[PDB]
Amino acid sequence: MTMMDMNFKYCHKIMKKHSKSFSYAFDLLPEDQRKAVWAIYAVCRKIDDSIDDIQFLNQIKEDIQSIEKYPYEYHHFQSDRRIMMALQHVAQHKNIAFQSFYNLIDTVYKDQHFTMFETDAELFGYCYGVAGTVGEVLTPILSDHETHQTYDVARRLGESLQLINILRDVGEDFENERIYFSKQRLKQYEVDIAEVYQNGVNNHYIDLWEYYAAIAEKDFRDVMDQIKVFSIEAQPIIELAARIYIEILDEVRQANYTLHERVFVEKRKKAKLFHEINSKY
Ligand SMILES: O=C(CC(=O)C(=O)O)NCCCc1cccc(Oc2ccccc2)c1
Ligand SMILES: CC(C)=CCC/C(C)=C\CC/C(C)=C/COP(=O)(O)O
Ligand SMILES: [Mg+2]
Numbered sequence: 001m002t003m004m005d006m007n008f009k010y011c012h013k014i015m016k017k018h019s020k021s022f023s024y025a026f027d028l029l030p031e032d033q034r035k036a037v038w039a040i041y042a043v044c045r046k047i048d049d050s051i052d053d054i055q056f057l058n059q060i061k062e063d064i065q066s067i068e069k070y071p072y073e074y075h076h077f078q079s080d081r082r083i084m085m086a087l088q089h090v091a092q093h094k095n096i097a098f099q100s101f102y103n104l105i106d107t108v109y110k111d112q113h114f115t116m117f118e119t120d121a122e123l124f125g126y127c128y129g130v131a132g133t134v135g136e137v138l139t140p141i142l143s144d145h146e147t148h149q150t151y152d153v154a155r156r157l158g159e160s161l162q163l164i165n166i167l168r169d170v171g172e173d174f175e176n177e178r179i180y181f182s183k184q185r186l187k188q189y190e191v192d193i194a195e196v197y198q199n200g201v202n203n204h205y206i207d208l209w210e211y212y213a214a215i216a217e218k219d220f221r222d223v224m225d226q227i228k229v230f231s232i233e234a235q236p237i238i239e240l241a242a243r244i245y246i247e248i249l250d251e252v253r254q255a256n257y258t259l260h261e262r263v264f265v266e267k268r269k270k271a272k273l274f275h276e277i278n279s280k281y
């Protein structure tokens with residue numbers, strides 16, 4: 001086991017620890033793409049966790065900026081050396097959309113002074129910023145020949161997974177003084193998240209919730225129709241990852257839209273979906 005290997009194995013460990021669904025799916029890729037995904041994931045994870053002062057976050061961004069500007073020089077990285085070595089290795093072989101990392105970093109900067117979204121257009125803007133961008137970064141890894149269409153589909157997939165995420169974590173997000181539903185939309189459906197958190201679900205909350213779920217689902221289906229932008233090996237894997245994540249919606253409904261648990265897709269269910277998909281291919 002080389003050192004580079006150790007860097008990637010650490011990235012993997014972070015991905016397994018933090019996302020069971022994406023780890024489950026993406027570990028099925030060929031070795032080289034697998035590892036590229038571990039590293040991009042681990043970077044994005046560290047950015048997302050970095051605030052836990054802007055101190056660390058500035059260092060990550062400077063690291064990323066060193067790699068962009070000097071891909072083949074040795075850097076003394078300021079943040080997480082193992083993750084940054086791995087990302088540099090990836091960049092040496094693959095076209096990385098660095099500005100997409102900076103979009104993500106800017107978005108995380110901004111959650112410091114967080115204020116609720118006035119309109120769905122802001123919320124969807126947020127979904128681009130934290131997920132759409134990541135879809136774009138992953139594009140060269142998951143497709144042979146990259147076009148505006150490939151980035152488009154990847155970005156839409158990312159944004160739809162983010163919305164499914166938001167839909168899982170309503171209650172936990174509330175505890176952490178975040179609400180992601182737009183004020184426009186809360187007013188229209190006459191929902192008050194505080195009230196629902198205390199008094200349990202109702203038919204307003206459920207309608208609002210399902211408004212957003214219907215959007216995520218439609219975007220999901222539009223991605224699937226276009227799965228072919230991706231390399232032949234990645235298609236079944238990206239369909240797995242998406243399907244496993246959208247299943248999260250059925251889990252929320254079955255738990256009656258609870259705001260006091262994180263629902264989950266059982267591992268045995270992940271494998272069921274793998275079967276269904278792996279058989280179509
Ligand atoms: O917001 C959450 C998560 C969350 O709220 C929760 O769990 O509550 N995530 C958005 C933060 C940015 C980010 C971080 C890490 C990995 C990411 O994407 C990849 C990358 C590669 C493969 C799959 C997915 C994106
Ligand atoms: C295959 C393709 C283009 C995917 C598109 C980009 C993508 C998958 C995801 C962004 C969604 C996120 C951040 C979900 C929650 O984070 P965890 O990973 O659970 O910590
Ligand atoms: Mg997650």
Ligand SMILES: [Mg+2]
Pocket residue numbers: 165166169
């Ligand atoms: Mg969340």
